[PDB]
Nucleic acid binder design. Structure first.
Lengths: 182, 181, 180, 179
DNA sequence: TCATAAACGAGACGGTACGTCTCGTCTTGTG
DNA sequence: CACAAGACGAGACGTACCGTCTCGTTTATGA
């Protein structure tokens, strides 16, 4: 029997990406997506339960555009500093920013997509950090509070202030936090 | 003139509705109906839904903004303050205020500006000032404050209730310790 | 509170779409658009597409209902009344009206009752009364009226604007002759 | 495949009974049969065309042959009375309503239904009159008048319309055909 | 002491979007 | 190698709110 149209799925996904880019999450209608992709609304509803699941699936496929590798060296401070700065750079590009904003918005509005987006974004970042500190044998309570403050520094700053938030502050926060672990 | 009864009604309905349905679930018509008011009397005094919500949050600002204790141990102070903040953002009310502050700020530029003035800026200021009351270099105070507030706010926003005073305090201790040569 | 003019605009728009679509392709959204109005202005004041359409039909009763001529020649009068009726159901508008009236009525009984009370009944009453003048058994009058209105209405419902004045008039002539 | 074409018709029939016209859906018909709706669309554009075929295959429950004896008034009265009974039975009223709706839904369908129902009734009357050397105009007008009376009346009033009324209109019309 | 204008409750207005529904065509796997 | 099962583009359905705009109807002085 009939099966899902790949062409329509691709068109929907791409149209959503574009509309978030030019309008934001709050500015996104299922109707606009359908129009822009030349599909019927129901082709969207058939496969996704909401605006939120659609948006989540669209961000997740772009998750590599934010998660860079964690550098491994004898020098742990410079590793987490490079990691923090690189992530900051990523989160202050036009789409890095719009991606973070959208990600926050969708998470606030629906718990399921917060969880999925977080296994897509939050968790791998924090685990890069905890893994890196676990290499230097740091008590997990501490490695946790540390990963907390390093990622939180960046994500919170980029959400409060905009693209103006510079690498340097992130790298500084990485240095302080790391030196705190004696 | 202006009706105070109507105003308190509207603000109270906006609070209760924020609490029960979150920001995305708040409609003006709902606020009006629960307040027994005509919705025009909401548009007459507030330029938008976001500004109204902003006002409501600011009026509640003292539930979240706590004064930095200034004793002899900067560590115990910053940790006291962090755990206190994390405890205050962890009740249904504090949490709802956090989520709302975020949603509203993400959607409206000037509402973001007001809420940053009323919440983010003073909270960064608390930590920053407290470190510049010793003589930590300014960049280091910025970055440290960035990290403490960052830890608390992003954690609460990620794990809600199951965030603890303890992790926020420990985080405070690690940051402060990273400031001693 | 309730806007006149919005109402007027919706009734005219409805008339237009029925006239062109007709009842089966009548949508609220097309009406709203055509009338420069919000849907909810239609939904607020009308429990159904049928009650809307029925108000629109009942306002145009005058276009169809005509006074019964009363002369010395009852044959002449019923011929004229019927030919005048069949003329008015053979116009673009009158025909679209009949189809709509019948379509609307089939779908809901309250609608059929309101239209039968604003249309069928005054016409059969017109005929029956005209014959009650000339003094005729009730059954005969009734079944004569059934056939005078019936010939016209069912001809027009079946074939369309190809139906004629002549046929209606002649049917009248025949029926009345038959009451001799 | 014409084994499917038939299994669809009686399925539409069966359904059309319990749901009536407005509540008919190609989807439901495809479901009752062992068939994908595309099979139904292979032979019919729409619901109206299919309902129309069902009805046409059941024309004989409505139309009955014109009696031809030595008494025209009796023949026509009999005809009109029989059609009148047929149109106010219970299934007959429902059928008439479905026929009218189906016609209103689309012009092409109103034409097929007129051609298989209205037309042979009219022509049965015109022909029965042409057998008595009545004028074509007068035979047509009398036809319009008898069929018209019955059909219009059953559409306007319920199933309460009676044999005697149709019969009476017949006697009146025929009486009026005399010099 | 009234009359008088503001602010008010109510809620109708032209609109946008929602999420559901059914139509008639298009697609694909299996029987 | 035809066809049931059903995905698809289209677009109307009736509902919920949006922000604007009348409506009478309180009120609270200051003429």
């Amino acid at each position: 029997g009939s099966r899902r149209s790949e062409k329509s799925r691709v068109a929907i996904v791409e149209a959503t990406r574009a509309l978030l880019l030019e309008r934001g999450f709050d500015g996104l209608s299922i109707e606009a997506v359908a129009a822009k992709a030349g599909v019927g609304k129901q082709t969207i509803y058939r496969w996704w339960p909401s605006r939120h699941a659609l948006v989540a699936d669209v961000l997740l496929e772009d998750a590599d555009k934010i998660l860079a590798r964690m550098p491994k060296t004898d020098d742990v401070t410079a590793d987490l500093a490079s990691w923090a700065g690189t992530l900051a750079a990523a989160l202050t590009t036009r789409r890095g920013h719009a991606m973070l904003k959208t990600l926050m918005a969708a998470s606030l509005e629906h718990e399921d997509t917060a969880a999925r987006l977080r296994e897509g974004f939050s968790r791998p970042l924090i685990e890069s950090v905890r893994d890196r500190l676990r290499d230097e044998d740091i008590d997990a309570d501490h490695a946790q509070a540390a990963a907390d403050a390093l990622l939180g520094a960046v994500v919170n700053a980029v959400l409060s202030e905009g693209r103006s938030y510079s690498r340097q502050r992130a790298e500084t926060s990485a240095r302080i936090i790391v030196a705190g672990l004696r």
